Amino acid sequence: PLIVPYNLPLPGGVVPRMLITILGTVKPNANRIALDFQRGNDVAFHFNPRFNENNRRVIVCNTKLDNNWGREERQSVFPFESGKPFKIQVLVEPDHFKVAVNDAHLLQYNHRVKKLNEISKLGISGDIDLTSASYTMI
Ligand SMILES: Cc1ccc(S[C@@H]2O[C@H](CO)[C@H](O)[C@H](n3cc(-c4c(F)c(F)c(O)c(F)c4F)nn3)[C@H]2O)cc1
């Protein structure tokens, strides 16, 4: 187990067929989780499960460019549960990130930041116990 926030380096950025796996357990009474794939200060892909946004659960996805958030993409399908272990898998594809949670497909997010080879850090934050963060090619 590791303590969050945690920064996972992605040396040389990301590339298609790179699979990033984040394992952890959601705390009881969690409010939020955040994964931030960063190109310097820009956030290419922000993946933000919110456990209570207006009394519902939603996943918010976005990009931050020059410190400004863009247009959000929201997913109501919500595979996380307070107190339960999870696996987030982010598969880099040519035109999008593909996310699966607990071995079930969840969402795709098209690349807004084009320079994949400069998306060189993944930040992991929020109401979790972090078990592991790693990557491999498939
Ligand atoms: C016009 C406008 C008005 C309001 C908003 S709200 C905004 O929405 C964004 C996604 O579009 C991001 O989610 C932002 N955000 C969340 C975290 C964060 C964090 F700082 C942590 F320390 C965590 O542990 C954690 F899990 C987090 F999520 N940082 N920035 C959010 O402030 C947008 C536009």
From Swiss-Prot:
Keywords: Acetylation, Cytoplasm, Differentiation, Disulfide bond, IgE-binding protein, Immunity, Innate immunity, Lectin, mRNA processing, mRNA splicing, Nucleus, Phosphoprotein, Repeat, Secreted, Spliceosome. The modification Phosphoserine is found at residue 76. A beta-D-galactoside binds at residues 69-75. A motif (Nuclear export signal) lies at residues 114-129. Its main location: cytoplasm. One of its GO terms (biological process) is negative regulation of T cell activation via T cell receptor contact with antigen bound to MHC molecule on antigen presenting cell. GO terms for cellular component: cell surface; collagen-containing extracellular matrix; cytoplasm; cytosol; extracellular exosome; extracellular region; extracellular space; ficolin-1-rich granule membrane. Residues 6-136 form the Galectin domain. A major expression is found in the colonic epithelium. It is also abundant in the activated macrophages. Expressed in fetal membranes. It is found in: Cytoplasm; Nucleus; Secreted. GO terms for molecular function: carbohydrate binding; chemoattractant activity; disaccharide binding; IgE binding; laminin binding; molecular condensate scaffold activity; protein phosphatase binding; protein phosphatase inhibitor activity. Galactose-specific lectin which binds IgE. May mediate with the alpha-3, beta-1 integrin the stimulation by CSPG4 of endothelial cells migration. Together with DMBT1, required for terminal differentiation of columnar epithelial cells during early embryogenesis. In the nucleus: acts as a pre-mRNA splicing factor. Involved in acute inflammatory responses including neutrophil activation and adhesion, chemoattraction of monocytes macrophages, opsonization of apoptotic neutrophils, and activation of mast cells. Probably forms homo- or heterodimers. Interacts with DMBT1. Interacts with CD6 and ALCAM. Forms a complex with the ITGA3, ITGB1 and CSPG4. Interacts with LGALS3BP, LYPD3, ZFTRAF1 and UACA. Interacts with TRIM16; this interaction mediates autophagy of damage endomembranes. Interacts with cargo receptor TMED10; the interaction mediates the translocation from the cytoplasm into the ERGIC (endoplasmic reticulum-Golgi intermediate compartment) and thereby secretion. This is Galectin-3. The chain holds residues 113 to 250 of 250 of the full protein.
